[PDB]
Structures are given as structure tokens and as C-alpha cells.
Amino acid sequence: NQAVLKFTTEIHPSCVTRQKVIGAGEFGEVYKGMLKKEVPVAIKTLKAGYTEKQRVDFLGEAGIMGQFSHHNIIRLEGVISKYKPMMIITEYMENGALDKFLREKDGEFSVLQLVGMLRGIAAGMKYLANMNYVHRDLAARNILVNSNLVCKVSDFGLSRVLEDDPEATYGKIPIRWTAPEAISYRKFTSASDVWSFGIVMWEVMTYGERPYWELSNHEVMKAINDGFRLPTPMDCPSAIYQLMMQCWQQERARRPKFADIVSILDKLIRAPDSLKTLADFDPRVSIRLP
Numbered sequence: 001n002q003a004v005l006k007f008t009t010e011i012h013p014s015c016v017t018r019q020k021v022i023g024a025g026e027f028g029e030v031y032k033g034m035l036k037k038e039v040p041v042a043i044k045t046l047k048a049g050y051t052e053k054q055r056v057d058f059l060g061e062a063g064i065m066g067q068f069s070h071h072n073i074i075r076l077e078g079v080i081s082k083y084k085p086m087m088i089i090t091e092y093m094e095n096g097a098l099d100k101f102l103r104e105k106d107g108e109f110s111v112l113q114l115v116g117m118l119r120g121i122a123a124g125m126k127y128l129a130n131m132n133y134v135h136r137d138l139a140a141r142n143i144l145v146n147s148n149l150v151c152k153v154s155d156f157g158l159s160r161v162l163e164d165d166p167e168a169t170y171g172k173i174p175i176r177w178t179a180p181e182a183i184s185y186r187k188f189t190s191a192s193d194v195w196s197f198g199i200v201m202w203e204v205m206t207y208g209e210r211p212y213w214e215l216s217n218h219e220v221m222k223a224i225n226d227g228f229r230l231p232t233p234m235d236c237p238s239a240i241y242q243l244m245m246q247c248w249q250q251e252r253a254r255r256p257k258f259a260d261i262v263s264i265l266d267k268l269i270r271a272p273d274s275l276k277t278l279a280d281f282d283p284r285v286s287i288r289l290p
């Protein structure tokens with residue numbers, strides 16, 4: 001990390017005030033705070049006693065983020081490494097994680113706003129892919145949302161990404177977001193990230209429904225292998241359901257690249273009447289009245 005850390009600003013602790021816990025784990029917490037006017041920031045700590053591996057993983061996330069400069073990728077402000085506890089300081093996303101946000105805002109956005117969120121996520125992912133960065137854990141829980149409704153990809157690093165995520169279960173993998181080839185033989189590429197993006201599309205258009213509902217991890221893998229796919233969300237544009245289905249091709253070579261996804265979403269947004277044509281929604285319940 002010593003090479004890539006030279007791109008990051010070392011911040012003095014007297015410039016940082018922590019104010020409110022917004023995330024927490026065994027080895028540190030994430031705070032909303034202020035950075036000296038003064039600007040809101042998010043602050044992640046690593047408490048004393050950390051191991052060499054933990055230090056390398058922790059500062060490695062900042063080192064990776066410091067290499068990126070894109071509207072849809074969380075921005076690094078700097079690090080505190082010369083004092084303890086060490087800290088990583090980023091821009092503050094006021095609306096938190098996208099999955100929880102949508103579940104708390106059920107039905108409150110237009111179809112155009114939801115597709116705009118997907119375009120922003122896809123733009124971030126195209127940037128990452130072309131920068132030769134494979135995310136491996138793309139999911140609504142790892143997208144953050146600000147007060148302009150801008151969605152930004154977060155959660156960077158090497159082994160810490162899948163190790164730290166409770167949704168990743170023993171390889172340790174978040175099964176129902178992961179492409180078949182990454183599950184079967186550990187092949188993680190930007191194309192398996194495209195599979196995950198298709199799941200994210202479904203999460204957004206359903207306002208945070210849990211993919212595959214109560215199917216077990218094994219049931220999900222069996223269903224996918226036998227050709228089943230997630231059904232159309234309610235009120236979902238046909239073009240958007242078609243696009244998420246193409247992300248879920250078993251044959252990795254047949255999936256769109258993020259370049260294609262960005263292009264398609266941009267065209268649909270720029271001609272928004274195209275989003276008024278809806279895919280048929282198969283009701284799970286029949287209600288009949290004389």
C-alpha cells in the first residue's frame with residue numbers, strides 16, 4: 001500500500017470530529033463527522049491491536065479508492081495513519097445504503113428516477129471494469145446514496161470485501177448475487193459483476209425485495225442451473241426487464257458489457273416515453289369480485 005498511499009492526503013486528527021455511529025463492527029466503526037469552512041464526512045476507524053493483515057486490508061481500501069476519480073465512485077478525502085486509531089475519511093452520503101433506503105422509501109420515486117439510479121451505478125461499474133477492478137460484491141447494500149439521489153459504488157479491497165460481508169457465506173460468497181462461474185469455479189471478472197448488476201437492477205425496481213425470497217442458497221443455485229430466473233418486478237419497463245435478463249445469461253460471453261448497459265440506460269432515459277411500456281407482471285394472488 002506504500003506506493004498507492006502516496007496518492008492520499010494524510011489528515012491531522014484535530015481536523016476531524018466524529019459525531020454519530022452509522023456503521024459498526026468488531027474492529028472499528030463508521031461515523032458521520034465533520035472535516036475542517038467544515039464539511040460532513042464519513043469516518044471509518046481501525047482500533048488498536050489490529051494485525052498486519054488488518055492494517056494492509058484497511059489501508060488497502062483507501063489505497064484502491066485513491067486511484068479512482070468518478071462521479072459514481074465514493075470519493076476519498078484522506079487517511080489518518082500517523083496517529084491511532086487509524087482512520088479513512090470519505091465524502092458523506094446522506095441517504096445511506098441503497099437497499100435499506102429503497103425499503104424505507106417504498107413506492108416514493110418515479111420509474112425515471114429508479115432507472116437514473118441504475119445508470120449511475122452502471123457508469124461507476126464501467127469505470128471500475130475499465131480500470132481493471134473487479135468488485136466481486138456488487139449489490140444494493142454496497143451502493144450509497146446522496147441528497148441528489150446519486151448512487152455511488154462502495155466497498156473496496158481485496159480479501160476484506162467478501163470476508164467482511166455477512167451476506168457472503170462459506171469460498172465465502174454472497175450466493176444469490178454471484179454469477180454461476182464465480183460460484184462454481186471462482187472465476188470473478190467484470191462479466192460476473194454484470195450478473196450482479198442484473199440483480200441490483202431487480203433490487204432497485206422492486207424497492208429492495210430480497211432476491212429469490214426465502215429460497216435457500218442451494219435452492220437458488222439449483223434454480224439458476226435449471227434455467228429459472230427472477231420474475232418481472234411490478235411496474236417495470238419492458239426494456240429494463242429485458243436488460244436485466246440479458247445480464248443473467250449463463251454463458252458469460254453473451255452478457256452485455258457495462259459499456260452496453262450504460263449506453264442502453266442513457267438512451268432510455270433520454271427518450272423517457274420508452275419506459276412507459278411495461279413488462280407483464282404475473283400476479284401471485286387472484287382477487288375476484290362479482
Ligand SMILES: Cc1cccc(Cl)c1NC(=O)c1cnc(Nc2cccc(C(=O)N[C@@H]3CCNC[C@H]3F)c2)s1
Nearest residue numbers: 022042043044074088090092093094095096097154155
Ligand atoms: C469512510 C469510509 C471508509 C472506507 C470506505 C467507505 Cl465507502 C467509507 N465511507 C462510508 O462508509 C460511507 C460514506 N457515506 C455513508 N453514509 C451513510 C451510511 C449509512 C447510513 C447513513 C445514514 O446517515 N443513515 C441514516 C439513518 C437514519 N435514517 C436516515 C438515514 F439516512 C449514511 S457511509
